[PDB]
């Protein structure tokens, strides 16, 4: 048989078979329903639109995200998305395919319990397993030590690992992620005159952020430069024309990751949380954590993020320590590649949660010897 690797994530679902190099199917985790009435008779449209199909009919739909920050708030929509992934995209029956799921650190136990219950009872998978994003990112990066930063669309967390031994007391979790950046981009575009409110225009703002935004090495210097020169303006084409221009907002939105005070958050920037997490570890393992800083996740795909992160860390870390940052080109799909590597290991075949074993041990088996 073969193993199936899934990654619910947040805002993007990427799933495929184990042993492959890239996910076979990638689509947003969006479920939509029509908010209008409809006058044509005999069309026979379905009740709800899920996955990438709902993106093609964005104009007559309202979009809801079942996952807010790692956790799952709506379960019927989550089951719909899982059914879509298992049937429409992969065309495989989950009755004979073990499923490896992915979960963020510092999450409620109820999430894992309900995930396993739905997987075992609604889909009848022969076996399953739940794993942490950061460990699988470290698997994909080819390292065995080093503090790893994972900033997706829902949550940002740092997990330091040394010689294959995790340090749970030094794991930091922050809710600042891409969705908050998109919301701040909305809040800042109104200053120029462009107002986006509808959930359909959330995708437009997200596309603008993805294709146009960049991280500035210096904030004050860039603000001074853009206040006089006009070389920073770039134009964007809306889905119906009406070209728009954007100036300072090009680099102010990503600065929220380093200046959380922009959106009123009390916490400090990722450049400081990473250093704090490194300092929470021992004193003999800090060299390898400094020299093996790993970045992964969608929000990390900003151009110029690595240079600013390294500059800030070097400004914080002692001058003697060498600071290195690993930013592979395939940062977004690092977690899935790590999952594909892990599920194909021979020693992993006895760490699955079996069907009868789960039946004996109850839904709370997840936190037992089998993780």
């Amino acid at each position: 048989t073969t193993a199936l690797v899934c990654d619910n994530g947040s805002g993007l679902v990427k799933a495929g078979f184990a042993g492959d190099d890239a996910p076979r199917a990638v689509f947003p985790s969006i479920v939509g329903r029509p908010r209008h009435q409809g006058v044509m008779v005999g069309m026979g449209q379905k009740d709800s639109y899920v996955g990438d199909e709902a993106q093609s009919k964005r104009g007559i739909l309202t979009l809801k995200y079942p996952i807010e920050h790692g956790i799952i708030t709506n379960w019927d929509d989550m089951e719909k998305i899982w059914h879509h992934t298992f049937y429409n995209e992969l065309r495989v029956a989950p009755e004979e395919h073990p499923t490896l799921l992915t979960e963020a650190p510092l999450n409620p136990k109820a999430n894992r319990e309900k995930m396993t219950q739905i997987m075992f009872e609604t889909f009848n998978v022969p076996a399953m397993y739940v794993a942490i994003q950061a460990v699988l990112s470290l698997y994909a990066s080819g390292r065995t030590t080093g503090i790893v930063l994972d900033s997706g669309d829902g949550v940002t967390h740092n997990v330091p690992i040394y010689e294959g031994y995790a340090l749970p007391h030094a794991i930091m979790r922050l809710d600042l992620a891409g969705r908050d950046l998109t919301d701040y981009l909305m809040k800042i575009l109104t200053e120029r005159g462009y107002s986006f409110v509808t959930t359909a225009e959330r995708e437009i703002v997200r596309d603008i952020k993805e294709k146009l935004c960049y991280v500035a090495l210096d904030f004050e210097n860039e603000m001074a430069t853009a206040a006089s020169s006009s070389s920073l303006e770039k134009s964007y084409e809306l889905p119906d024309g009406q070209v728009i221009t954007i100036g300072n907002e090009r680099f102010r939105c990503p600065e929220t990751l380093f200046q959380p005070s922009f959106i009123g958050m009390e916490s400090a920037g990722i450049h400081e949380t990473t250093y704090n997490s490194i300092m929470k570890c021992d004193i003999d393992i800090r060299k390898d954590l400094y020299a093996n800083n790993v970045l992964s996740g969608g929000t990390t795909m900003y151009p110029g993020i690595a240079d600013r992160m390294q500059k800030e860390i070097t400004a914080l870390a002692p001058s003697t320590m060498k600071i290195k940052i690993i930013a592979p080109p395939e940062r977004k799909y690092s977690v899935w590649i790590g999952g594909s590597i892990l599920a194909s290991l021979s020693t992993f075949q006895q760490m699955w949660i079996s069907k009868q074993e789960y039946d004996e041990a109850g839904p709370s088996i997840v936190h037992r010897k089998c993780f």
């Binding site: 960049y214 151009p303 110029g304 240079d307 500059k311």
Partner: protein
């Protein structure tokens, strides 16, 4: 009479429309290439100045160590 003139005009319109479409496609291709090159060169500008400053302070430290050793 007029029908051949209209047919020729339509054929010319189609030909110039195809040429215009190709012109755009090449325009976005060139613009994307130029933007990528500009982003890369700016990033490694920042890298090269920071590296040069690192070399400068390394030389200063070496001079201080040399005089202290003397």
């Amino acid at each position: 009479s007029l029908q051949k003139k209209l047919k020729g005009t339509e054929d010319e319109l189609d030909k110039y429309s195809e040429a215009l479409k190709d012109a755009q496609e090449k325009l976005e291709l060139a613009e994307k290439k130029a933007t990528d090159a500009e982003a890369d060169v700016a990033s490694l500008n920042r890298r090269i100045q920071l590296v040069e400053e690192e070399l400068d302070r390394a030389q200063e430290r070496l001079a201080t160590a040399l005089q202290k050793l003397e």
